[PDB]
Amino acid sequence: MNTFIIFIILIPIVGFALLAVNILLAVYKPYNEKLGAFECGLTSFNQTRLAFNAAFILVAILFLPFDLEISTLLPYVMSIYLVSNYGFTIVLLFLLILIIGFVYEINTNALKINKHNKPNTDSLIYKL
Amino acid sequence: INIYAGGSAAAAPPAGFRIHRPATWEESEEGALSKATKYFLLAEMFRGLYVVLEQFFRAPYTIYYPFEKGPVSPRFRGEHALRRYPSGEERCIACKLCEAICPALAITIDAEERIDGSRRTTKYDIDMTKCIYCGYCQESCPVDAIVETPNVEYATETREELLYNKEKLLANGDKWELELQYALDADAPYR
Amino acid sequence: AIIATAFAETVKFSGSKQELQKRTLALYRQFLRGAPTFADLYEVQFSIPTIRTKIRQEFERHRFVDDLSIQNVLYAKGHMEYQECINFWKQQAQFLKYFPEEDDIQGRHQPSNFVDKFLKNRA
Amino acid sequence: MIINIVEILIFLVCVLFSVAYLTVAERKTLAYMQRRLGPNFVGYYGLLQAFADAVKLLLKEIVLPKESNYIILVISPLITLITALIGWVVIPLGPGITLGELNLGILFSLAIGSLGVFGSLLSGWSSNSKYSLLGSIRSTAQLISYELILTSIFIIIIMFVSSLNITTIIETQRVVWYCIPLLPLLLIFFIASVAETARPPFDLTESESELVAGYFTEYSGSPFVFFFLAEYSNIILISAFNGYLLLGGYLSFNYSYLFNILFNDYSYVSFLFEGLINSSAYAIKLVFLMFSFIWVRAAFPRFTYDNLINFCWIILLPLLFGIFLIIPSTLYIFDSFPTLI
Amino acid sequence: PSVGQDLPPVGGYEPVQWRRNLPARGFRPLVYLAALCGICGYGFYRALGGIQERRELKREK
Amino acid sequence: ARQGSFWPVTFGLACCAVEMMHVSAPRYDQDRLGIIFRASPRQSDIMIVAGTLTNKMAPVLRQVYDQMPEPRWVISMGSCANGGGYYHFSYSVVRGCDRIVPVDVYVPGCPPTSEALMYGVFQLQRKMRNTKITRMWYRK
Amino acid sequence: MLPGGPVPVFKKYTVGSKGIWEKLRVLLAIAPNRSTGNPIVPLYRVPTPGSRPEANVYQDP
Amino acid sequence: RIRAFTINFGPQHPAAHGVLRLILELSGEEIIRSDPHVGLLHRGTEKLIEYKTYMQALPYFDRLDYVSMMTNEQVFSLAVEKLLNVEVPLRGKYIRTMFGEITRVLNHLMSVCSHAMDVGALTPFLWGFEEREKLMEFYERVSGARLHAAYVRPGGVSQDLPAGLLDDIYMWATQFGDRLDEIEELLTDNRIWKLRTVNIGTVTAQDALNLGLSGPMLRGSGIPFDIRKNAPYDAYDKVDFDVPVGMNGDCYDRYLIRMAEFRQSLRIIEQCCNDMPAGAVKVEDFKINSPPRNLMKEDMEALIHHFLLYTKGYSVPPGETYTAIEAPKGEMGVYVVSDGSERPYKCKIRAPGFAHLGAFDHIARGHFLPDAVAIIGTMDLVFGEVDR
Ligand SMILES: CCCCCCCCCCCCCCCCCC(=O)OC[C@H](COP(=O)(O)OCCN)OC(=O)CCCCCCCCCCCCCCCCC
Ligand SMILES: CCCCCCCCCCCCO[C@H]1O[C@H](CO)[C@@H](O[C@H]2O[C@@H](CO)[C@H](O)[C@H](O)[C@@H]2O)[C@H](O)[C@H]1O
Ligand code: SF4
Ligand code: SF4
Ligand code: SF4
């Protein structure tokens, strides 16, 4: 029984203290419209999802590889002395190869949100 | 000197109405490194932070209300009151000009001949929940009977307490006569 | 520009009863098709048949009108109400103005002859 | 294990009451910046405002709407609060004065911070609402996007000290605090801290959603108290990360001369004064960083989601992928790759 | 007539400030960049010097 | 606790909201008394009806009121909300939020000054300060 | 100057600093011209509106 | 097919400063169609005015745009004066001008510092509202009400200025410039403000005219139009002020226009405090205006006229007029019809916010939702005037 172990178990199996205090002390007599949700608002049986832009999911899909890159750099910073001037060059090559993909990401503009209703920029020409 | 076709000397554009032209990245009187320092070091943002911090060391404007009140003037329009003469007789004479000018129709009056032959009211009611606190009644009265005190601290728990009647208004005048006298001595020459 | 809403119809006054006939029948069709939506959107305590009965009643109310322009105005206001109901702009409170019959019986004494109304001062 | 319980209870009490008074500090500092004063009426000088708020909330109904989920709505605050509080186990207030003296402390911090995203994820699932499920998505995108920058700064610091022991990272800064060689990283870490805490100028979905009927945290009662504790504890913990990475943690001037003057041998007064000085340093740094959070709330306007994602992924990460190359090169040029411990 | 009216003074009032008064402040930006570079260079001199001493202490250990 | 944390819902409909905002301003600081205006009713304890109540808006008012967790109170701010006011005889105005929701304190004015709304807040504070919670159970 | 600014502090009817604190404020200010907008209490809204002497001599213009 | 998703921005919510039901349709983040639903603050003002004398009807206008009261009653007074064919005295004109610009300062302090708050800047709101309090005190000292003064009436002004008000207004004016400067330090050159404002809500000059926009909304697109310079009404032909006009039609240009208008209003207030004439503040025709009390209580004609003006009212000649002012929101107008009676036959208020919120659909299409907040904030929408 170390203080670390005591704390990390005690926080979860005690965190419901004020939860129970609130459940026992506080009123609970619901209405229909107190179980409701808004000022106005409704939706028929149309669908279960909304159409979303690609960047919304691409940021999450690209979080995985860049996070794995930055987490794969942890062995290097914990081995930096032992891999002296060899692993340094190796991790630099690693970072350059992974910067090429970041360059691709920037040049494609993959996290940009595009706008449909463009403003009209075409001249007004009158057939005489 | 000039004849105009569908136009005017005023409708002609001013001398420099055509803006000069946008400025490109060339024709820049500011080096790239300097504006990049302003870009990376957040110059204007730190300046705004400092302008906010300068206020941290300035006097707060806050007045502690139940113990210190805010500025009131003789013209202020608050709770209503029916006034008397120094005789003790009531000033109102049932002329019904306040009932007539009231935009909200908050005043309700009924009158008849008193036992001593005098024109005096038997009913005088104000629905505060109709009133807009405009002062037209205080302007219309030719005897300074209906007035508006400087009071605002008369909130209630029930709306039936805001249907003021003649006795309430007369008691309110008997309560607030000194404040009303200060206000009148300050305000009457201007009205 | 300022574009119209979902179920908008440009105001176009028919110059014929035979065209307004088709327009009115189409609007009736649309109300009937949308009654399930009116029951789902507004938390309605009664049948979809009841909603369609009410629609038919309100369409029968103006059945024997013959002035064309009055019929045009009635069609326009009917389409306004359809757009207000199908697009969830109304609330239940305003939708249930059409349905006073479904609310419980308003008391015991509802006069229908003279002496009742007299005793209640409604004659 | 008696004194272990005592140490834990002292630490818990001090941390939680610091949170409760950070709420009041936020309000009063923002006020005096705004040429006002408040709160000053619900205790003497306003020192019971947070406890009044807590006691009110712990007597309110725990209404859960019709088309919502009971369990998720109720435990998401609690999971968020647990994860916010167990991150304090590794925070040292002295040379080894810690609850958890883990040699993998940085990774514990960086891994328990990885779990704070689940609160914002699961909040959206506590209703049959299709737009709150997108506000959830936007918030989670922000959080996972600035996690990378915090982790990158962690690794750039660990390039200088090859250890994941927080006390060792602090004791390496007896020479120089890492805010001096890496002053821009201090700005970047503070910015990413404000963004991870979802605090203004990065308060998009809270601001977004109070407009709409949904997409924010519409909790009542005890969930609400737990969320406030989580927020104002994560603020102090991310400022703690700032501290022990860049501002030296508990370090100050060297007080050997003063102690040799005042004392002649190790006593318990000596140890108490050492501890008070060290934790005083740590606390004044935390106070400055919390004041900075409040200042930034007072000063600037808000971002949009596009501007924010663009900020992150097109301005900040390029600099850091460059710094990943420049720091080991600077260590290679001068033969200064750091040893273990 | 006009007896007790609120009227202005004879020489009017001293003029007020209604134009923008946001003065330019601060050193030129390259001074701030030079200070940054010097701060960080000195910090690197101080830190890398400490890494070498730690390495020698490790040798001792 | 109910006094020192006094969180109304943001229900400003008309020109009485200007005085509410001035009660949040530096001269009169509502935050000094614990007051924080909360957007959603689920986090709120008070509803200050500050503005005229139109017949197109009353269902929304009642929905907002019913979404509030108990304990809940209502302040009627201004003549328009107290008894319809200036627009008492209109075709679109409700003659008081009394008709739609129950009211605990009526603040009169048009507009009621910031001081008057603060006096109303103090009157509701006195009401809740004289409220019997456990004592009434001990009677029941 | 121009006809519309800037104007010094001592020509602005606001309560400022005195002594070492003014010497510090003019050192730490973005614009020492700027004022702390607290009205001078001896001069602002004094005599009060309900105690003005001009009421006794006021006549209808 | 691009299926759209309908969100109600909220009958009750923060960004609307009042009560608005903005039914937006989105395809992702982008707005494609908007449908501002109004009438939630329709109180039947324009029918009530038909049952009121011209004096009883004047407080309807204080309560339309309730941050700019005196300008609304100014335009109604101008309309009824044009029908009555009476001339306001010079002192009344100067008072109306000075207080119209105080009212402009109040409106812009609300509008800019609520736009800021809705975009996220909380601190300018609380700075500017103290200056609002300082000016509300002048309102209260002249009229007796902090907000709804009922001061500017047909024929001039209700009451003369109290003693010692010009000195205090000058004392406020000596320091208001630094307040403006401190707000600008936070907002003007800021990156986040420019991001939230630059090239958002763009409207062209041609479309600005076609949609009926005026004020800053029309001046930000490049058209130099201001009714105070093109059709001066009270005293703006006797005071020097410049008009700010912007290119690019964005919200940043409107913000800069409103700050320039702050400074020009301060200029006008200085000139009016220096050049305030002597004399009467209302017309000296007791068939239109109430006489003084000391004559009503000593003169028979004065009392007769008091009685009639406060019971029946003054009868306006038959006719009709549309007159307008450069209200701080834009071109505010009143179309009055007179039937020779003491009560109007018809009073339509052309509120500047009605047209702007109607143009919301054209202006906000293609934008993201955070930008709709800025657009609502730069339109400066109070909903008493929208709904009347
Ligand atoms: C250091 C920390 C120390 C902490 C110290 C704390 C000490 C507490 C000592 C408490 C002893 C006294 C308790 C008296 C409280 C009662 C208060 C009261 O008188 O009534 C107010 C409230 C009313 O609830 P209600 O009966 O529904 O009335 C509706 C209209 N007001 O009454 C209430 O609030 C009652 C709350 C009851 C909460 C239970 C909710 C139900 C949960 C279980 C499910 C059972 C549901 C059954 C509902 C009925 C269904 C038909
Ligand atoms: C954590 C301890 C356990 C008990 C829980 C305590 C809960 C109390 C939390 C309060 C923390 C401060 O949080 C609060 O700050 C200020 C208070 O003025 C609010 O701010 C409100 O006030 C005004 C100030 O006049 C602001 O301009 C802002 O527009 C808003 O209306 C914030 O919207 C809210 O977030
Ligand atoms: S001041 Fe009040 S009571 Fe008198 S007329 Fe006006 S609204 Fe009616
Ligand atoms: S209060 Fe005055 S105006 Fe009204 S009826 Fe009496 S005397 Fe006439
Ligand atoms: S009571 Fe008066 S101030 Fe309040 S909303 Fe009604 S008219 Fe406006």
Query: Residue C98's domain spans which residues?
Result: 1-123
Q: Tell me if H80 sits within 8 A of H152, measured CB to CB.
A: no
If one counts every other C-beta atom within 10 angstroms of the C-beta of residue A30, the result is 15
Q: Tell me if D15 sits within 8 A of D233, measured CB to CB.
A: yes
F-facing residues of D in 11-40 (CB < 8 A) are 27, 31, 34-40
If one counts every other C-beta atom within 10 angstroms of the C-beta of residue C1, the result is 9
| Cβ–Cβ gap B70/F118 under 8 Å | no
Q: Tell me if H92 sits within 8 A of H99, measured CB to CB.
A: no
Helices (H), chain H: 45-48, 59-62, 69-84, 90-119, 123-143, 165-187, 191-197, 205-210, 216-219, 227-230, 251-274, 293-296, 300-311, 352-364, 369-379, 383-387
Taking the CA atoms of F117, F118, F119 and F124 in sequence, report the sign of the dihedral they define: positive
Using a CB-CB distance cutoff of 8 angstroms, which residues of chain F are in contact with residue D135? none
Resolution for this model in angstroms, one decimal place?
2.7
Q: Which residue on chain B is closest to F99 by alpha carbon? A: B159
What is d(CA B70, CA B140) in angstroms, rounded to the nearest whole number? 29
Q: What is the DSSP secondary structure assignment for residue H349, as one 8-state letter?
A: E
Question: Residue H348 in 3-state DSSP?
Answer: strand
Q: Tell me if D115 sits within 8 A of D230, measured CB to CB.
A: no
What is d(CA E39, CA E32) in angstroms, rounded to the nearest whole number? 10
Query: Both tokens of residue A25?
Result: 């002390």
Domain containing residue H229: CATH number: 1.10.645.10
Among E6, A99, B27, CA closest to H278 = E6
Among H3, H1, H38, H4, CA closest to H22 = H38
What is d(CA F103, CA F120) in angstroms, rounded to the nearest whole number? 12
The CA distance from B45 to the nearest CA of chain D, in Å, is 8
Q: What is the DSSP secondary structure assignment for residue H37, as one 8-state letter?
A: E
What is d(CA G17, CA G31) in angstroms, rounded to the nearest whole number? 15
Residues ≥6 apart with Cβ < 8 Å to E41: none
Q: Which residue on chain A is closest to H8 by alpha carbon? A: A41
Length of chain E: 61
CA distances H81 to H155, H276, H316, Å, are 6, 22, 9
Q: Are strands B107-113 and B119-127 parallel, antiparallel or unpaired?
A: antiparallel
Residues ≥6 apart with Cβ < 8 Å to D294: D25, D26, D29, D30, D33
Residue matched to tokens 């704070």 = D116
What is d(CA F104, CA F102) in angstroms, rounded to the nearest whole number? 7
Q: Are strands H319-327 and H156-157 parallel, antiparallel or unpaired?
A: unpaired
Query: Residue H39's domain spans which residues?
Result: 5-379
**Residue B90 burial by CB count (10 A; 0-12/13-18/19+): exposed, middle or buried?**
buried
Interior/surface letters D254-268, b for 16+ CB within 10 angstroms, e for the rest? eeeeeeeeeeeeeee
Residues ≥6 apart with Cβ < 8 Å to H345: H50, H337, H338, H339
What is d(CA D284, CA D169) in angstroms, rounded to the nearest whole number? 19
| Cβ–Cβ gap B52/H186 under 8 Å | yes
Residues ≥6 apart with Cβ < 8 Å to B113: B119
Q: What is the DSSP secondary structure assignment for residue D202, as one 8-state letter?
A: S
Q: Is F110 on the interface with H (CB under 8 A)?
A: yes
Query: For chain C, what is the domain count?
Result: 1
Q: Which residue on chain G is closest to H181 by alpha carbon? A: G34
Q: Rounded to 5 degrees, what are φ and ψ at D48? A: -130, 15
Task: Identify whether H54 is part of a domain.
Answer: yes
Query: Both tokens of residue A18?
Result: 């004020």
Query: Both tokens of residue A17?
Result: 């203290």
> Does the CB atom of residue B169 touch ligand 3 within 6 A?
no
Task: State the first-to-last Cα distance of chain H, in angstroms, to the nearest integer.
Answer: 40
The CA distance from E31 to the nearest CA of chain G, in Å, is 19
If one counts every other C-beta atom within 10 angstroms of the C-beta of residue B94, the result is 18
DSSP H/E element including B177: helix B166-187
Among D45, D49, G39, CA closest to B61 = G39
| Cβ–Cβ gap D300/B42 under 8 Å | no
If one counts every other C-beta atom within 10 angstroms of the C-beta of residue G28, the result is 11
What is d(CA F20, CA F37) in angstroms, rounded to the nearest whole number? 10
Three-state secondary structure of H200-219? CCCCCHHHHHHCCCCCHHHH
Q: Tell me if D85 sits within 8 A of D234, measured CB to CB.
A: no
Domain containing residue A61: CATH number: 1.20.58.1610
The answer on whether B102 is annotated among ligand-binding residues is yes
Angle at H35 between CA H32 and CA H36, to 5 degrees: 130
Q: Tell me if B83 sits within 8 A of H152, measured CB to CB.
A: no
Among H161, H168, H171, CA closest to H276 = H161
CA distances C113 to A70, C107, C120, D232, Å, are 90, 17, 11, 74
Taking the CA atoms of B153, B97, H76 and H49 in sequence, report the sign of the dihedral they define: positive
Query: Both tokens of residue F133?
Result: 């919670």
What stretches of B70-191 adopt beta strand conformation (E)? 80-82, 107-113, 119-127, 146-148, 163-164
CA distances F35 to B61, F7, F125, Å, are 18, 5, 12
Bridge partners (DSSP) of residue H324 are: H333
Q: Rounded to 5 degrees, what are φ and ψ at H24? A: -95, 150
Residues ≥6 apart with Cβ < 8 Å to D263: D269, D270
What is d(CA C45, CA C52) in angstroms, rounded to the nearest whole number? 14
Bridge partners (DSSP) of residue H35 are: H23
Task: Identify whether H303 is part of a domain.
Answer: yes
What is d(CA H376, CA H98) in angstroms, rounded to the nearest whole number? 29
Query: Quick one: which atom of ligand 1 is closest to the CA of A28?
Result: 40
| Nearest CA residue ID for atom 22, ligand 2 | F36
Q: Tell me if B186 sits within 8 A of B75, measured CB to CB.
A: no
Query: For chain H, what is the domain count?
Result: 1
Q: How far is CA H86 from the centre of its chain?
A: 24
Helices (H), D197-304: 204-211, 222-246, 256-262, 268-299
Task: Identify whether A121 is part of a domain.
Answer: no
What is d(CA D139, CA D133) in angstroms, rounded to the nearest whole number? 10
Query: Residue A78's domain spans which residues?
Result: 3-28+32-108
Query: Both tokens of residue F32?
Result: 């000094």
Question: Residue B40 in 3-state DSSP?
Answer: helix
Q: Tell me if H82 sits within 8 A of H288, measured CB to CB.
A: no
Angle at B13 between CA B12 and CA B16, to 5 degrees: 150
Q: Tell me if D202 sits within 8 A of D142, measured CB to CB.
A: yes
Q: How far is the CA of B146 from the centre of ligand 3 (A)?
A: 10
Query: Both tokens of residue D131?
Result: 């737009």
Q: What is the DSSP secondary structure assignment for residue B20, as one 8-state letter?
A: -
| Cβ–Cβ gap B73/H290 under 8 Å | no
Q: Rounded to 5 degrees, what are φ and ψ at H74? A: -65, -45
Give residue A108's identity as a one-letter amino acid code. Answer: T
Q: Are strands H5-8 and H21-27 parallel, antiparallel or unpaired?
A: antiparallel
Q: What is the DSSP secondary structure assignment for residue H368, as one 8-state letter?
A: B
Give residue C54's identity as a one-letter amino acid code. Answer: K
Query: Both tokens of residue D210?
Result: 């109070």
The CA distance from H161 to the nearest CA of chain F, in Å, is 22
If one counts every other C-beta atom within 10 angstroms of the C-beta of residue A2, the result is 12
Q: Which residues of F are annotated as a binding site for [4Fe-4S] cluster?
A: 15-16, 80, 110
Give residue H216's identity as a one-letter amino acid code. Answer: P
What is d(CA D109, CA D113) in angstroms, rounded to the nearest whole number? 6
CA distances D163 to A86, D243, D328, D336, Å, are 20, 17, 16, 15
Of all ligands present, the nearest one to the C-alpha of F140 is 1
Residue matched to tokens 């179920």 = C7
Give residue B58's identity as a one-letter amino acid code. Answer: R
Bridge partners (DSSP) of residue H323 are: H334
If one counts every other C-beta atom within 10 angstroms of the C-beta of residue D271, the result is 11
If one counts every other C-beta atom within 10 angstroms of the C-beta of residue F93, the result is 25
What is d(CA H388, CA H65) in angstroms, rounded to the nearest whole number? 9
Angle at B57 between CA B55 and CA B62, to 5 degrees: 75
Q: Are strands H152-153 and H30-37 parallel, antiparallel or unpaired?
A: unpaired
Bridge partners (DSSP) of residue H5 are: H26
| Greatest pairwise CA separation for chain A in angstroms | 94
Task: Identify whether H47 is part of a domain.
Answer: yes
Among C48, H159, C15, H295, CA closest to B190 = H159
Task: Identify whether H63 is part of a domain.
Answer: yes
For every residue of chain A, DSSP letters joined together read --HHHHHHHHHHHHTTHHHHHHHHHS-----TTTS---SS----SS-S-----HHHHHHHHHHHHHHHHHHHHHHHHHHTTTS-SSHHHHHHHHHHHHHHHHHHHHHHT-SPPP-SSPPP--------
Query: For chain D, what is the domain count?
Result: 1
If one counts every other C-beta atom within 10 angstroms of the C-beta of residue H126, the result is 24
Q: Tell me if B98 sits within 8 A of B107, measured CB to CB.
A: yes
Bridge partners (DSSP) of residue H321 are: H336
Q: Are strands F46-50 and F8-9 parallel, antiparallel or unpaired?
A: parallel
Breaks in chain B (C–N > 2.5 Å) following residue: none
What is d(CA E42, CA D328) in angstroms, rounded to the nearest whole number? 17
Q: Tell me if H93 sits within 8 A of H74, measured CB to CB.
A: no
Residues ≥6 apart with Cβ < 8 Å to C123: C114, C117
* Sheet (strand H5-8) strand order: H5-8, H21-27, H30-37
Q: Tell me if F109 sits within 8 A of F81, measured CB to CB.
A: no
Task: Identify whether A95 is part of a domain.
Answer: yes
Query: Residue D210's domain spans which residues?
Result: 1-340
Q: Rounded to 5 degrees, what are φ and ψ at F58? A: -65, -40
If one counts every other C-beta atom within 10 angstroms of the C-beta of residue H90, the result is 17
Give residue B19's identity as a one-letter amino acid code. Answer: I
Q: Tell me if E19 sits within 8 A of G4, measured CB to CB.
A: yes
Q: What is the DSSP secondary structure assignment for residue H366, as one 8-state letter?
A: T
Angle at D82 between CA D79 and CA D86, to 5 degrees: 145
Query: Both tokens of residue D157?
Result: 């610091």
Task: Describe the crossing of helices D132-158 and D204-211 by its angle, rounded to 10 degrees.
Answer: 170
Q: How was this structure determined?
A: cryo-EM
Query: Both tokens of residue B88?
Result: 């003790």
| Cβ–Cβ gap A95/D325 under 8 Å | yes
Q: Tell me if H262 sits within 8 A of H179, measured CB to CB.
A: no
Query: For chain A, what is the domain count?
Result: 1
What is d(CA E5, CA H162) in angstroms, rounded to the nearest whole number? 8
**Which of F66, F69, F71 lies closest to A33 in CB terms?**
F66
Task: State the first-to-last Cα distance of chain D, in angstroms, to the nearest integer.
Answer: 30
**Residue B153 burial by CB count (10 A; 0-12/13-18/19+): exposed, middle or buried?**
middle
Q: What is the DSSP secondary structure assignment for residue D312, as one 8-state letter?
A: I
Among D208, D228, D207, D211, CA closest to D219 = D228
If one counts every other C-beta atom within 10 angstroms of the C-beta of residue E5, the result is 20
For every residue of chain C, DSSP letters joined together read -----TT-------SSHHHHHHHHHHHHHHHHHHHHHHHHHTT-SS-HHHHHHHHHHHHHTTTT---HHHHHHHHHHHHHHHHHHHTTTS-HHHHTTS-SSSSPP--S----SHHHHHHTT--
For every residue of chain F, DSSP letters joined together read -TTTSB-EE--B-STHHHHHHHHTSSSS-GGGGTB--BSSGGG-SEEEEES--BTTTHHHHHHHHHTSPSS-EEEEESHHHHH-GGGTT-SSB-S-TTTTS--SEEE--SSPPHHHHHHHHHHHHHHHHT--SHHHHHH-
What is d(CA A119, CA D125) in angstroms, rounded to the nearest whole number? 37
